[PDB]
Amino acid sequence: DLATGAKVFSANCAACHAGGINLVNAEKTLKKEALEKFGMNSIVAITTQVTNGKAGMPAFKGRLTDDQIAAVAAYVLDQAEKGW
Amino acid sequence: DLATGAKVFSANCAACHAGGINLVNAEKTLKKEALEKFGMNSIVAITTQVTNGKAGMPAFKGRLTDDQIAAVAAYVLDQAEKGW
Amino acid sequence: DLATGAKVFSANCAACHAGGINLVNAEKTLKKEALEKFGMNSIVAITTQVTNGKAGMPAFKGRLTDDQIAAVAAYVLDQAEKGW
Amino acid sequence: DLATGAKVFSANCAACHAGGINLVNAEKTLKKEALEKFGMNSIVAITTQVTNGKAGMPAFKGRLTDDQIAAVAAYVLDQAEKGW
Amino acid sequence: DLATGAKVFSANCAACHAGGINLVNAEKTLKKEALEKFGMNSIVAITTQVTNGKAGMPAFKGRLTDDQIAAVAAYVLDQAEKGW
Amino acid sequence: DLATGAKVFSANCAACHAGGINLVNAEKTLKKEALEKFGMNSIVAITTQVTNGKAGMPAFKGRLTDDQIAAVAAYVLDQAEKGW
Ligand code: HEC
Numbered sequence: 043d044l045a046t047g048a049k050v051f052s053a054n055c056a057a058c059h060a061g062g063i064n065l066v067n068a069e070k071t072l073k074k075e076a077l078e079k080f081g082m083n084s085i086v087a088i089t090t091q092v093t094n095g096k097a098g099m100p101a102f103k104g105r106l107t108d109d110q111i112a113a114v115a116a117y118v119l120d121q122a123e124k125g126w
Numbered sequence: 127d128l129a130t131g132a133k134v135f136s137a138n139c140a141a142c143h144a145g146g147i148n149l150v151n152a153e154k155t156l157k158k159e160a161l162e163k164f165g166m167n168s169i170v171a172i173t174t175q176v177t178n179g180k181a182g183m184p185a186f187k188g189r190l191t192d193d194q195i196a197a198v199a200a201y202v203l204d205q206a207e208k209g210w
Numbered sequence: 211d212l213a214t215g216a217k218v219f220s221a222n223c224a225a226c227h228a229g230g231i232n233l234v235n236a237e238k239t240l241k242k243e244a245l246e247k248f249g250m251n252s253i254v255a256i257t258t259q260v261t262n263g264k265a266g267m268p269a270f271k272g273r274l275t276d277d278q279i280a281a282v283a284a285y286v287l288d289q290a291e292k293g294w
Numbered sequence: 295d296l297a298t299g300a301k302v303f304s305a306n307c308a309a310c311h312a313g314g315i316n317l318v319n320a321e322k323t324l325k326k327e328a329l330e331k332f333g334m335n336s337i338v339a340i341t342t343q344v345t346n347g348k349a350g351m352p353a354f355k356g357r358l359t360d361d362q363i364a365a366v367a368a369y370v371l372d373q374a375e376k377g378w
Numbered sequence: 379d380l381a382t383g384a385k386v387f388s389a390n391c392a393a394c395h396a397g398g399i400n401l402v403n404a405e406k407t408l409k410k411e412a413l414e415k416f417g418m419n420s421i422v423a424i425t426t427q428v429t430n431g432k433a434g435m436p437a438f439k440g441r442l443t444d445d446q447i448a449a450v451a452a453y454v455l456d457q458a459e460k461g462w
Numbered sequence: 463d464l465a466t467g468a469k470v471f472s473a474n475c476a477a478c479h480a481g482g483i484n485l486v487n488a489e490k491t492l493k494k495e496a497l498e499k500f501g502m503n504s505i506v507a508i509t510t511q512v513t514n515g516k517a518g519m520p521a522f523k524g525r526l527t528d529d530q531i532a533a534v535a536a537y538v539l540d541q542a543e544k545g546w
Pocket residue numbers: 051054055056057058059064066067069070071072073076077080081082088091092096097098099100102114115118393394
């Protein structure tokens with residue numbers, strides 16, 4: 043759910059995406075407008091990138107359960123709307 | 127207008143000012159409060175800096191039409207109020 | 211008060227915490243959610259860190275009066291709620 | 295030559311690559327090892343990217359002469375070798 | 379060895395430490411002087427931190443083999459000595 | 463001397479200049495070439511800026527003794543020469 047995404051995000055994502063930014067590839071933020079722009083505004087899109095990684099973003103298949111992954115894709119999606 | 131500023135901003139400004147920050151000179155953000163503080167909160171101020179550049183900010187006279195420049199100064203001004 | 215925190219923040223804090231970020235230790239932002247997470251969401255917590263510093267954050271005992279310190283802890287607390 | 299190279303770099307490239315870094319896409323530095331790793335360790339490789347751009351890196355076609363681009367590409371390779 | 383070290387670093391560490399920097403916690407670089415200053419100038423020191431993680435640095439236990447971690451620790455020390 | 467210089471730098475300057483970088487204003491690094499380019503390659507130039515501050519760089523007057531500032535200026539010049 044939502045409170046478990048907030049916890050998973052704090053443990054695995056905050057280093058690079060603190061408060062919705064992207065320290066590694068600056069334009070590829072977690073902001074709503076950016077998520078729309080790169081077509082990552084979806085639970086499908088996020089859950090697959092988190093799984094297989096992409097460029098500087100690591101893969102999280104192996105250490106996140108696809109229940110925690112679905113939940114953190116959803117936390118991302120919820121703060122983006124609120125925005126951050 | 128507004129939708130053409132969103133496009134121009136994505137193509138020319140997002141590298142340094144992704145989501146209203148400034149990666150090059152940290153305090154000189156595009157946030158409302160910062161725009162007021164440095165007296166850049168105006169279409170005049172923005173359109174002239176974009177044209178002639180300033181320190182690490184390049185000049186965009188030559189590659190942006192002063193119709194695209196006026197529009198992106200306005201996109202900046204619209205996200206700042208909404209804020210970002 | 212509030213307008214004097216805005217001035218003190220601009221003079222002493224904006225270099226590292228421009229618009230609520232943290233350029234030095236990325237996750238330790240001034241955002242509401244981060245302030246809660248690290249237990250810095252309080253005038254007590256902020257006023258003591260500002261005074262004694264902590265890791266890369268300097269101490270401001272000596273150059274900020276504990277009237278300016280109380281006020282800037284409060285500016286931080288006010289933009290965090292508004293958020294930034 | 296490297297002196298015109300050095301002047302072009304200072305005026306156009308140092309905002310995002312100061313000292314051989316990459317502020318926008320952190321792994322794509324101007325250090326010799328990254329230039330080798332991404333296949334950008336040649337005049338032609340560099341001249342092509344500077345001319346046309348790639349992602350957050352601007353196109354310099356029509357802003358810099360071909361001689362300026364050649365010179366800046368040479369300067370990058372030279373600085374990389376010396377260790378910036 | 380340093381070649382497997384170099385490949386592991388590229389694939390897992392360059393996102394936050396490209397060129398010996400630290401994007402997340404700026405003072406904790408991979409430069410020889412910072413490694414000495416924070417007591418991280420040994421294989422065992424580095425292997426332990428890579429394995430278990432610390433704050434914003436991820437744990438690599440179970441993601442990288444012990445041999446890969448050993449090799450990456452060796453590569454870090456070697457690059458530090460050469461000056462990245 | 464450089465040992466007191468090294469201790470002062472670690473305690474006061476590494477937050478924004480770790481390894482010779484400039485986290486706040488990216489082009490104004492402590493590398494020898496940038497120090498030359500901005501006319502900051504002298505003890506007097508550095509002691510003056512450290513003492514009085516400039517823009518996002520804090521004033522250290524009254525926080526550091528004149529001897530500490532002298533020593534840190536010497537250390538900067540020395541590290542620049544060695545290549546940080
Ligand atoms: C923790 C599990 C997460 C979550 C939920 C996200 N990230 Fe990252 N991220 C990083 C980089 C370099 C990119 C760009 C990759 C590329 O070039 O395409 C991303 C991208 C994303 C997105 C898409 C954003 C967009 O605007 O397109 C999303 C939704 C996302 N991430 C979520 C870098 C890192 C890290 C640095 C080592 C870490 C850790 C994470 N990401 C972890 C996570």
